[PDB]
Amino acid sequence: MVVIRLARGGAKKRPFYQIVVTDSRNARDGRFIERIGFFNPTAQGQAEKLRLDADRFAHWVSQGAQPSERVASLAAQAKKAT
Amino acid sequence: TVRTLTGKVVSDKMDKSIVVLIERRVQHPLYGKSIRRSTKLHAHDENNVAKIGDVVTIKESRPISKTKAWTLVEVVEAA
Amino acid sequence: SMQDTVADMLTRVRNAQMAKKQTVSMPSSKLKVAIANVLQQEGYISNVEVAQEETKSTLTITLKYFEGKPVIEMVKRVSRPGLRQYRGKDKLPSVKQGLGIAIVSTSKGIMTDRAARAAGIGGEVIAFVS
Amino acid sequence: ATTNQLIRKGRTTLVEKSKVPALKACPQRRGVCTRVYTTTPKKPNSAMRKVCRVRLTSGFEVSSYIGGEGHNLQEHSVVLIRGGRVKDLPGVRYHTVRGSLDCAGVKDRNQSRSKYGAKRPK
Amino acid sequence: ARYIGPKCKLSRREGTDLQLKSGVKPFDVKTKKANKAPGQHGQARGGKQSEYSLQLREKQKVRRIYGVLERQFSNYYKEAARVKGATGENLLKLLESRLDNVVYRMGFGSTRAEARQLVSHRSITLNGRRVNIASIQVKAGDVIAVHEGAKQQLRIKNAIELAAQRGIPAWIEVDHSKLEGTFKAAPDRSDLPAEINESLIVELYSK
Amino acid sequence: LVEKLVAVDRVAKVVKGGRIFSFTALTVVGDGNGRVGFGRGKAREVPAAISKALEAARRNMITVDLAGTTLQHPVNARHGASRVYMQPASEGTGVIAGGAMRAVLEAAGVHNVLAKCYGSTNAANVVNATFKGLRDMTSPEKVAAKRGKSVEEIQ
RNA sequence: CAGAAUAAGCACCGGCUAACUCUGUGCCAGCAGCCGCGGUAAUACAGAGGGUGCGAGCGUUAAUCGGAUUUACUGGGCGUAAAGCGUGCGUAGGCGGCUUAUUAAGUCGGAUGUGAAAUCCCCGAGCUUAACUUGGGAAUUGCAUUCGAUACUGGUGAGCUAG
RNA sequence: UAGUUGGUGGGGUAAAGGCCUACCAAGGCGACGAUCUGUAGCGGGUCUGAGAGGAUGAUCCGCCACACUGGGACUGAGACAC
């Protein structure tokens, strides 16, 4: 099914995740339908940790996409933030 | 808003079909001179209205045979 | 046979200037008249006349010399029947860093490159003059 | 040419062949020594220069110059050859690298040692 | 890496005083061989030189004074070319903005070499951090302070004595009692000495 | 005055019993503010040849209309089989050219230019081509004057 | 906490090309990217001294582009240097005199859609600095649809006489 | 080039279609290079270059094809299935 999940990037020991909407059969770091935010686990200084687009998130969730557990937790964090 | 191409009939031997020669003018990629180019397209005319020498207009459609995927619209100029 | 009347007119002007003659006459056409008027309004030539007898028209141009030298130091034909040159507004040519003129045929008429840039239009580059 | 001529037929570019066909686009090539001999340079130079006949792994029998004052190469010796031209021996288009599979470095040298393969003396 | 070697050989070769001897005595009195190159064939400075030769000697002169090797110098030049403005002047600004050179021009290092060792041994701090890299470029508004372990040192006391003998540059302002100073902006070309020529270096790299 | 020795050469003529050998020198002299000249000098000795070339270059001088430290417009020039192209450049570029063209450009006073050589690189011919191009360069004021229009109108 | 204590090689010095001398050896040994050097005063061969350029690296070989305006669209040539078919006629093709009306194919302008992300460039952020990672922008110089302009080229109708 | 090009009836497929078949007609492609023959996975990109251009497809991303060689189907939403 269509899913919303984290694709890995960055360097060793310091991952940086793109929050992407994709078909579950695609590879983790490959083909995707849309990019709707990022997540930096080790942000410091002025670096922003979480940016999620609530409008597109709601749109895709309404169209039947199933978030992963981590993305659901991050969406809850962003809901509390705003 | 069907795509439409205007040409002139060059054959009418086939049954319920016509062949129309379409010409375009484009610039040369390296030297820039305007140069002639042409393509021949098979069309479908159920009633055999068009004949050799007339100017016609055709539109795109679903395949009707192995080589024909275009259909007659009007005879712009009769031969 | 004769196949480029604009080139023929430009060549006649150039050779007359090199031979240091005050006037040059040739068969006339409306395109040549327009080009001559543009040259006159840009100051390369003094005067332009057209005289008709029965059905044949003759264009006469008066030439200028300054400091004992031809005013038109360089005149070149750009677009020819063999190769035709069309340029957009952004890519219009400049002659001697704007010290010359490029004659341009546009839908609004025959004008210089700077005027064409001001109008935001392009067209056919006819000649370079400086 | 004219514009129409250039349109009908374009401009022709001619390729260039390899000055070292034996290598076959390789930095080095293994070989087996077939005959060690000494030949006479062409004029105006007069000398005796050491060359060898080698059957390469590629399959082209070739001539390889031997550099350095002293050489111990003999028949049935597995050597390594590289590109390089003597410029005065006709038909010689390669060098044999010292310090290689069977070749040894030149003794009693202390300048340009990395060439000729001599190791560091204390 | 780093160039560890005799300094006066290089100074005499360059033909001008490079200021690597701390100036405690006059350089002329110290070396007593200036205008004569060190070597068997050493000839007077009046010998003719080629265009490429002069272009090369200029780069060598700058590199020797600022203690920068060829790879880093080439990176500096390419950076100056990328940066807008006069590339030659930008290159000199980049050289001047170095942390160890700034420490020297601010006056806690007897020699640029000594400042390099201080930075390497972490006796200097950028703002509140114990940096240990001499190649760091000091931005405007930075505060070069001394560390507590570095303080109460005979070498540092002698260095500040020599700095007081010297004249502090305008752009730096350093309190010696507090052993800390601050950086306003990149020194201007007019402030930089006119002996150095940068156009030769620009042409050298352009070739 | 800036003086530059573009080149020096050794030449010979045949006579009974051997060869007579001489030297020739090509030199350029300028002020740096826009006046430049070049000359040739021959003699049995290099010191004499260089001096004669200096006098010839002094005699043969022109004036050039510069645009600050760059040319007024791109220029194409030729003499014999030597062709030279010169283009104005933004401040800081420098003089990107060959030695023969560089001598003339420095003598004239241009410090920002991009130059190219097409054809034979004979030093004398290249110097002559650069000389004629710089001489034949025009100016916005002169163009406006000969056209009869204002400099502002010319733009 | 201990103490300078554990740590520097490679190439080259005739011209192109920054850096020269002695010894040994002599058209041999040999060096050599090209011009070249070597038959007893070789700064071009081997060692040594001194230097020059790089530096945890330094040299050689192999390969692509550049210099190369030696395939020339930008941007070359054919009397003697390479290059006008022995000379006509003519088919396909290329190009084509003047005026006027109409069309809007070429040509030109505006709008919409598209041109994935990464990569290039610009301004920032996190890395002690830099590499590197990253946020945004620009760019993607094109393609398609549609609405407009009519000087030039082409299509159509009509007129003309200098070819 | 003789299912070859087109048409009609029928068959067949999830679906248009000579995709298959009986008949009818003689068509269809080609100097704007058909047919034959040599070589090659293609693009975003990468290297070089003032630019035009030239060379190239490791590592990252999209598409395609293949799984000891060749011919087949079965099951299943989906394979002619490393």
UniProtKB/Swiss-Prot annotation, chain B:
SUPFAM superfamilies for this protein: Nucleic acid-binding proteins
A Gene Ontology term for the protein's cellular component: cytosolic small ribosomal subunit
The entry's keywords: Ribonucleoprotein, Ribosomal protein, RNA-binding, rRNA-binding
Listed GO MF terms: rRNA binding; structural constituent of ribosome
Keyword Transit peptide: no
Pfam families: Ribosomal_S17
Cleavable signal peptide: none
GO process terms (BP): translation
InterPro entries, alphabetized: NA-bd_OB-fold, Ribosomal_uS17, Ribosomal_uS17_bact/chlr, Ribosomal_uS17_CS
Binding partners and assembly: Part of the 30S ribosomal subunit.
Function: One of the primary rRNA binding proteins, it binds specifically to the 5'-end of 16S ribosomal RNA.
Family according to the record: Belongs to the universal ribosomal protein uS17 family.
Entry protein name: Small ribosomal subunit protein uS17
Species this protein is from: Acinetobacter baumannii (strain AB0057)
UniProt gene name: rpsQ
Curated annotation (Swiss-Prot), chain C:
Claim: RNA-binding is one of the keywords in the record: yes
Claim: Transmembrane is one of the keywords in the record: no
Protein name as it appears in the record: Small ribosomal subunit protein uS8
Gene Ontology molecular function: rRNA binding; structural constituent of ribosome
Gene from which this protein is expressed: rpsH
Subunit structure, interactors included: Part of the 30S ribosomal subunit. Contacts proteins S5 and S12.
Species of provenance: Acinetobacter baumannii (strain AB0057)
GO biological process, one term: translation
Family from the record: Belongs to the universal ribosomal protein uS8 family.
Species lineage: Bacteria, Pseudomonadati, Pseudomonadota, Gammaproteobacteria, Moraxellales
GO cellular component: ribonucleoprotein complex; ribosome
UniProt KW keywords: Ribonucleoprotein, Ribosomal protein, RNA-binding, rRNA-binding
Function summary: One of the primary rRNA binding proteins, it binds directly to 16S rRNA central domain where it helps coordinate assembly of the platform of the 30S subunit.
UniProtKB/Swiss-Prot annotation, chain D:
Entry annotated with the keyword Lipid metabolism: no
GO cellular component terms, semicolon-separated: small ribosomal subunit
Pfam (any one): Ribosom_S12_S23
Keyword rRNA-binding among UniProt keywords: yes
MF GO annotations: rRNA binding; structural constituent of ribosome; tRNA binding
InterPro entries reported for this sequence: NA-bd_OB-fold, Ribosomal_uS12, Ribosomal_uS12_bac
Superkingdom of source: Bacteria
Listed GO biological process terms: translation
CDD domains: Ribosomal_S12
Positions where 3-methylthioaspartic acid occurs in the chain: D88
UniProt keyword list: Methylation, Ribonucleoprotein, Ribosomal protein, RNA-binding, rRNA-binding, tRNA-binding
Family according to the record: Belongs to the universal ribosomal protein uS12 family.
Described purpose of this protein according to its UniProt entry: With S4 and S5 plays an important role in translational accuracy. Interacts with and stabilizes bases of the 16S rRNA that are involved in tRNA selection in the A site and with the mRNA backbone. Located at the interface of the 30S and 50S subunits, it traverses the body of the 30S subunit contacting proteins on the other side and probably holding the rRNA structure together. The combined cluster of proteins S8, S12 and S17 appears to hold together the shoulder and platform of the 30S subunit.
Subunit text: Part of the 30S ribosomal subunit. Contacts proteins S8 and S17. May interact with IF1 in the 30S initiation complex.
Protein name as it appears in the record: Small ribosomal subunit protein uS12
Organism: Acinetobacter baumannii (strain AB0057)
Swiss-Prot record, chain E:
Superkingdom in the source lineage: Bacteria
SUPFAM superfamilies named among the record's database cross-references: Alpha-L RNA-binding motif (SSF55174)
Keyword annotations of the record: Ribonucleoprotein, Ribosomal protein, RNA-binding, rRNA-binding
Coiled-coil blocks: none
Start and end residues of each stretch annotated as Disordered: 23-51
GO cellular component: small ribosomal subunit
InterPro entries documented for this protein: Ribosomal_uS4, Ribosomal_uS4_bac-type, Ribosomal_uS4_CS, Ribosomal_uS4_N, S4_RNA-bd, S4_RNA-bd_sf
Swiss-Prot/TrEMBL GO biological process terms: ribosomal small subunit biogenesis; translation
Residues of the S4 RNA-binding domain: 97-159
Entry similarity comment: Belongs to the universal ribosomal protein uS4 family.
Known role: One of the primary rRNA binding proteins, it binds directly to 16S rRNA where it nucleates assembly of the body of the 30S subunit. With S5 and S12 plays an important role in translational accuracy.
Name of this chain's protein: Small ribosomal subunit protein uS4
Native species: Acinetobacter baumannii (strain AB0057)
